Design a protein around this ligand. Structure first.
Ligand SMILES: [Zn+2]
Lengths: 121, 49
């Protein structure tokens, strides 16, 4: 018993399935929210996130599944770029947020600002 | 008056504030915005005596 999308085993006892929130609107819808105020791409914070395969298995990112062409989707509470708060307070909720193009990093010079960042079309 | 309770010999440098600023003065040294980490709320580990 193996996932045909992420490969994970079904008898694997750490394995978990994704649980959406209600609000959960899909990516384009949520992006048009007033809770949000040098790129031609929006740039937001994002809390309480989960990453998963089409079949709904939580998935790591570093394992190179994106690089093996596997569509991974995500969900949580998008927040305002300036918003320091990691609670779901001033945020709108998204679901199945478009397949992950790239994932990146930054913070390798100055302070301990190692920020992990997802990229979507 | 706002800073969360710690105990003798506290060593965790970065910790959550766990509460809003209470006095004027506090409001001024924390900034007119949110900041999660409270840095250097650490105190000496005094002898059991
Ligand atoms: Zn899967």
């Amino acid at each position: 018993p193996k996932c045909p999308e992420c490969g994970q085993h079904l008898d694997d006892p750490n394995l978990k399935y994704q649980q959406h929130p209600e609000d959960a609107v899909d990516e384009p819808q949520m992006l048009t929210s007033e809770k949000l105020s040098y790129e031609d791409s929006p740039m937001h914070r994002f809390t309480s996130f989960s990453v998963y395969c089409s079949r709904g298995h939580l998935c790591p990112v570093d394992t190179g599944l994106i690089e093996k062409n596997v569509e991974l989707y995500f969900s949580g509470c998008a927040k305002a770029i300036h918003d320091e708060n990691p609670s779901m307070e001033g945020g709108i909720n998204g679901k199945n947020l478009g397949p992950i193009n790239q994932w990146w990093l930054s913070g390798f010079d100055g302070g301990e600002k190692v920020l992990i960042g997802f990229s979507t079309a | 008056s706002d800073l969360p309770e710690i105990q003798n010999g506290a060593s965790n440098s970065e910790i959550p504030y766990n509460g809003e600023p209470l006095s004027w003065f506090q409001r001024q040294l924390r900034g007119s915005h949110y900041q999660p980490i409270l840095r250097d709320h650490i105190c000496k580990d005094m002898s059991p005596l």
